[PDB]
Design an enzyme around this catalytic site. Structure first.
Site, PDB file in Angstrom:
ATOM      1  N   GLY C  11     -11.332  -1.536 -10.356  1.00  0.00           N
ATOM      2  CA  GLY C  11     -10.042  -0.748 -10.368  1.00  0.00           C
ATOM      3  C   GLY C  11      -8.769  -1.330 -11.330  1.00  0.00           C
ATOM      4  O   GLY C  11      -8.447  -2.340 -11.300  1.00  0.00           O
ATOM      5  N   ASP C  35     -13.110   0.438 -14.211  1.00  0.00           N
ATOM      6  CA  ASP C  35     -12.835   1.681 -13.839  1.00  0.00           C
ATOM      7  C   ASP C  35     -13.468   2.783 -14.305  1.00  0.00           C
ATOM      8  O   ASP C  35     -14.075   2.700 -15.338  1.00  0.00           O
ATOM      9  CB  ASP C  35     -11.284   1.975 -13.725  1.00  0.00           C
ATOM     10  N   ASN C  85     -12.783   5.140   1.220  1.00  0.00           N
ATOM     11  CA  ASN C  85     -12.857   3.924   0.808  1.00  0.00           C
ATOM     12  C   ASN C  85     -14.264   3.120   0.831  1.00  0.00           C
ATOM     13  O   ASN C  85     -14.684   2.518  -0.387  1.00  0.00           O
ATOM     14  CB  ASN C  85     -11.754   3.096   1.250  1.00  0.00           C
ATOM     15  N   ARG C 141       5.191 -14.151   1.943  1.00  0.00           N
ATOM     16  CA  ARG C 141       6.349 -13.376   2.504  1.00  0.00           C
ATOM     17  C   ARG C 141       6.932 -14.202   3.818  1.00  0.00           C
ATOM     18  O   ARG C 141       8.190 -14.284   3.868  1.00  0.00           O
ATOM     19  CB  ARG C 141       6.017 -11.885   2.786  1.00  0.00           C
ATOM     20  N   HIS C 165      -3.946  -6.369   9.779  1.00  0.00           N
ATOM     21  CA  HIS C 165      -2.892  -5.464   9.012  1.00  0.00           C
ATOM     22  C   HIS C 165      -1.988  -5.047   9.828  1.00  0.00           C
ATOM     23  O   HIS C 165      -1.866  -5.001  11.027  1.00  0.00           O
ATOM     24  CB  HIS C 165      -3.741  -4.320   8.026  1.00  0.00           C
TER      25      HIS C 165
END
Lengths: 301, 302, 302, 301
Positions: C11, C35, C85, C141, C165
């Site tokens: 990708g 890609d 996906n 984070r 997630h």
């Protein structure tokens, strides 16, 4: 499959210790620090080991007196009297052929060119896989002194030293470049004289003594250690990098097959090529005298 | 205005030389290597200078015996009997306040807490700009041995050593964690025992001797040099980094104005804060005894 | 035998391009940027190639649309509706097992735990050599916001995010420490409140949207790319590093053979171990709900 | 006293974003990413901020639309139609003179040499403190292509591009060196032909299009960003490094005081010197044509 890179450093003196330190610090490889002397390599390896976390490195650094521990070494750096030096090399050569015959071997043992030739002979390793560290140290000094004169970053100076040692060392003034400007062009611009160039050349030859006279109880070890690591990186990262070093030269510089100081290309196959510099007639003769000296001393051993 | 950063290294011994080497290698600063001895700092500085191009660094590294050369130094690292070392610090103090009074001073002299305090008193530099190196070295060894037991990256181990030198050293087992898992949690999981923890704590205290006995004719210097560099980096780059070091503790750990090994936050204003670890009763006693020895040895001053 | 390390990036989008950039910059490996799109991987690879000399790196970086070019790849990072996906992963799986079945595969596809599992099942690579990237991003984070509260270096903060997630994400507040001081200890010292901890936990969960709303026409890519690189580094350098990621959990966290966000040890054999954090009852429920959603979405497969 | 180094990046496009990323990653400085566009600089700065811990960096990276936030900037990198480009520079020039007049300013805005001259004029900053990024990008491509041909590390190739852009760009074949071996010496050794050298020179000129045609919806941004960071390092670390860039040149290359692409020496005082390369008669004319083009377009604005 993934294995950690492995560098064996033979000799836990001042050069060997700082090689292990830098290699570990950079996380270039694991280090095996070999020496017969009791305690020394273990102590330095323990000390260096404690610093790895400080540098964020996971390199493993151990001390030993057993050649078995250098099994699978990608690089062997030999830092450990003419006859006495040969005895040490013979011993390592047996260790390398039994435990790591695919290793790239870098020698730091005087007289260099002669000793490198000897290790190749007794080990039987491919000629392209055995070399000596001198040129990178000498070339770095050469570049530094030219950089100091012009007031520029030494990294932007191109300057190579070839041949042997002492008066056999040949700083190739014709190789000298600063930001693409040749030395001959600077003379014409009035930014340097031939007298100052001659002094820099002379300074490169005697720099070892400038350091030795100041240290009083030893010879240079910070720069020689850095130089050996740079040669090892070139190999391990397959850089195709220009490395002045004692290498097996055939069909360059008028020789047919001999170890001498030359600008090599180093990659994953060791010495993969040799560059031919323009030499002035006086540089030719000095280079010829260096070749003869190595060739003659090789008749003795 | 841009000037290059500048680090003065006082003492051209084994620790001093490697500090200069590593600082130069990283291009952290220019280096002035100071010593009384004829030639030694000059020779090491020239040798290190030759390696700068190899590392791609433009750092300048010079040897000197003149304190005027340390002027404008952002960081001063001091590596050079009780009264004999304090005599050296007096001489260095007079150099510092004359030529670089705004410098961040890191001391590496035994006994640390006493000697750091003495330099602060004689130099009269702000308390936050004078500290000593030990906690980073000791904690690194501590983290390393914990790492070695668990078979993990030592950087992923949090472990702090506070208190004083040698026997006065306190590896705070309550500060220990690996990837967020506390040391007591590993005991319950059967991955480590208390006896193994005690060995690691013990190992941390005598690691210096394990090295020294092996080197035969000297003490550790690779790791101490690196530890000093990390401290200088924390200041020069204003990291707000957790640095265990000998620092002036005003209102933490039950003390009121004494130099002692504590987990500091180091940034551009030097020691900017001190963290408080949860200490078990046993660790408190050990810390108390360390603080008590600092009072005694400092009092000896005639 | 020395060959250069080789990383395949599947990708050539924003995350993919920056992975190649950073890998090349660090000289970690040669890079094959794969890609389908005409020209894009080629153009980025040429551009990145021109910067290699600037960084002093000899890494080779090439663009391709041919899976034969990923042969001998040590690491494969996959950045390229649920079924849409999985269709991409099927195609990548066939490339991998054909041309580089010994590769360490890091997936970056939503929903992560489901997609990673699917790649493992279709590729049939050993469970330890297939994982997903999320935990490193989320934990970074998390560590950053804790760091920002306390005004300290984020590298000195230990903080782990596990689970799934978005909402299924679990910032384990019990894993949190700063220089050895646990989060509960800061509460007692008056340096942080539970409400502030809850905000930081909440902030961690929606940080993606804070970025996305600002970028307007895309999602985060600088930090995700870096997170993937750190994972590849852990494998390539055999670090035994604590990497929170989507990994096959066999006998930890009360589960028996499922992909889920856990603190792994990554080395040369891929995922080599999993650490067990002390979870409070509330964190257990949250983890349970994350695991339960993975079963449901994975079951949907017709 | 110690302050964190501060780099302001004007424009949160693709180049600006990657500059901030790399600067932060290397911990070279704090970054202020300025753009008028709402959200973009804040989002990239937040994203980059999250990665700092991953790289072990404590660099602070923020997004803004207020020039007040670039107060005390050590370096300003300007990435943000001829007239339209001038409008942007005028705006930044006012911000810089109010908030950071001691900043070293690096322009990445076409047509470069003309735009650099304009920023100097409107800002009134010392000529040595304002420059443009082109030469490092062009020179890096030049070096890379020569490196590819010889199969060597590009870092060991010395090769500079001077002059302007497109056909005004002058890859100085006379500056070319590989491990100290000049290009003329390779021709004699049969390792390269004049035809292959001409192709490399041509390839350097059109490389931008090779990338642009492949990207389809934009121009190069990874390499231009790296180049700007290298220029900023040279300044911040006072490297005295050789940096080909759009700089104020007087008494070199036959000009008396004009912005053009030249090999500079950069340190803590910005452009501190300029190197004079040997140029072939055809390179002289092309350089002359580039100078004229800049000088003429400067009459318009």
């Amino acid at each position: 499959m993934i294995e950690r890179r492995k560098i064996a450093v033979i000799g836990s003196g001042q050069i060997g210790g700082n090689i292990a330190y830098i290699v570990g610090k950079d996380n270039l490889a694991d280090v095996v620090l070999f020496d017969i002397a009791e305690g020394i390599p273990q102590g330095k390896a323990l000390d260096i080991t404690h610093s790895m976390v400080m540098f964020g490195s996971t390199s493993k650094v151990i001390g030993t007196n057993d050649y078995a521990d250098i099994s699978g070494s990608d690089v062997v750096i030999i830092t450990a009297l003419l006859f006495g030096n040969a005895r040490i090399l013979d011993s390592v050569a047996e260790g390398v052929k039994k435990y790591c015959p695919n290793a790239f071997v870098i020698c730091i043992t005087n007289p260099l060119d002669v000793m490198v030739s000897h290790f190749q002979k007794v080990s039987g390793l491919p000629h392209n896989k055995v070399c000596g560290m001198a040129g990178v140290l000498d070339s770095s000094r050469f570049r530094t002194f030219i950089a100091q004169h012009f007031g520029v970053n030494a990294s932007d100076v191109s300057a190579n030293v070839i041949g042997g040692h002492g008066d056999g060392m040949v700083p190739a003034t014709s190789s000298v470049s600063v930001g693409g400007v040749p030395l001959s062009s600077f003379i014409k611009q009035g930014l340097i004289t031939q007298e100052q160039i001659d002094e820099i050349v002379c300074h490169t030859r005697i720099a070892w003594k400038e350091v030795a006279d100041n240290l009083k109880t030893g010879t240079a070890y910070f720069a020689p250690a850095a130089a050996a690591v740079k040669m090892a990186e070139a190999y391990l990262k397959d850089k195709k990098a220009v490395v002045p070093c004692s290498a097996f030269c055939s069909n360059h510089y008028g020789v047919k097959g001999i170890y001498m100081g030359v600008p090599t290309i180093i990659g994953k196959n060791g010495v993969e090529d040799i560059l031919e510099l323009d030499l002035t007639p006086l540089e030719q003769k000095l280079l010829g005298e260096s070749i003869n000296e190595v060739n003659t001393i090789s008749k003795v051993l």
